[PDB]
């Protein structure tokens with residue numbers, strides 16, 4: 001008898017799913033992935049619930065101040081996000097001390113401004129040996145009273161938001177009838193992208209594929225492989241229409257491409273640390289692809305999408321094998337050689353795009369002028385607002401020898417902690 005509890009309100013939208021309120025308890029009947037069959041103790045109704053909307057009773061995830069699986073960097077992002085304030089905090093799983101916890105607190109430093117500081121929690125629990133606690137709630141309650149050595153007196157738990165409704169169960173292949181393609185967002189050589197609604201309840205994006213040398217079944221086995229290479233920083237693939245012309249249904253990214261977003265009013269107001277953060281998020285996506293021994297092949301700001309929350313995700317991963325030289329590595333233009341190192345070059349160019357708020361690479365120059373200038377050994381100069389250290393990241397991406405370009409694993413780690421000395425990752429306290 002496994003009782004779980006709702007962490008958020010959920011409104012039912014399908015045939016057999018349950019509505020519930022935050023706090024409602026339920027018996028688990030079946031653990032079938034993203035959807036679980038449950039019985040609500042509040043309503044007595046049996047049906048399906050999103051497994052990520054609930055957690056086991058009295059376990060830590062039920063706590064408003066606990067955040068499961070959040071990294072140090074993502075803790076910073078959450079705590080710095082709109083709606084928080086001085087002393088805003090969270091307790092979370094320790095990224096580097098497996099099995100243990102860490103505390104992240106929002107602070108203000110005169111020189112830099114808003115910041116997040118991190119304290120290791122020592123397992124009974126303590127941060128300093130002079131203050132020991134049986135529970136984390138005890139721990140939380142003490143530092144709410146006064147800063148006992150901490151950078152800031154604890155105030156309010158970090159703002160959380162409802163996670164995304166998972167896709168309808170068993171709905172990978174859907175009939176075209178379930179869609180209304182309401183607004184053409186983009187159009188090109190290989191098809192179109194539309195804002196769309198699925199079965200009157202869910203906003204999505206649909207990429208329409210023009211018929212081609214691609215074999216129908218060959219195209220689907222490829223898409224079915226991409227659906228397994230899921231990651232937070234890769235556009236989620238939701239569904240497919242298997243009948244020509246092929247529709248690919250993905251999550252809707254409310255702010256469009258990074259390219260268009262940066263060239264916008266709201267984009268041009270993004271200060272430099274934001275842009276680097278965007279870069280780090282993309283690099284994290286590319287680090288996943290790198291680990292999986294895959295390749296993207298078409299990295300640039302037009303193939304990065306931005307969510308309403310300013311989360312950047314990589315789009316069109318995989319479309320390259322199923323089917324703009326100013327972003328391409330020499331050994332890939334002059335030869336056929338595309339590797340992850342060619343993506344690294346492309347990332348460097350992307351890095352420039354970001355810092356130049358969308359400006360086209362090599363402005364004034366053109367494709368043949370560029371290819372010849374590459375064989376010289378020309379590289380784009382450092383823009384006025386780009387820090388020297390960010391620039392030499394780009395330069396390292398632009399080595400002629402592909403094997404001398406750094407990994408995305410390393411790039412991500414440098415961009416993530418760009419403003420933080422390694423020794424200052426965690427705080428010390430007597």
Ligand SMILES: Nc1ncnc2c1c(-c1ccc(NC(=O)NCc3ccccc3)cc1)cn2C1CCCC1
Pocket residue numbers: 185186187193205206207222223226235237248250251252253254255256257305315316317318319322
């Ligand atoms: N998801 C979105 N949400 C909101 N706006 C979006 C988009 C997209 C978008 C971009 C790329 C893709 N590509 C894609 O899903 N490829 C999946 C695939 C297909 C076959 C094989 C492997 C992978 C889908 C949607 C594009 N756009 C805008 C339309 C023009 C610029 C951005």
Ligand SMILES: [Ca+2]
Pocket residue numbers: 423424425426427428
């Ligand atoms: Ca330290």
Ligand SMILES: [Cl-]
Pocket residue numbers: 027039
């Ligand atoms: Cl019961």
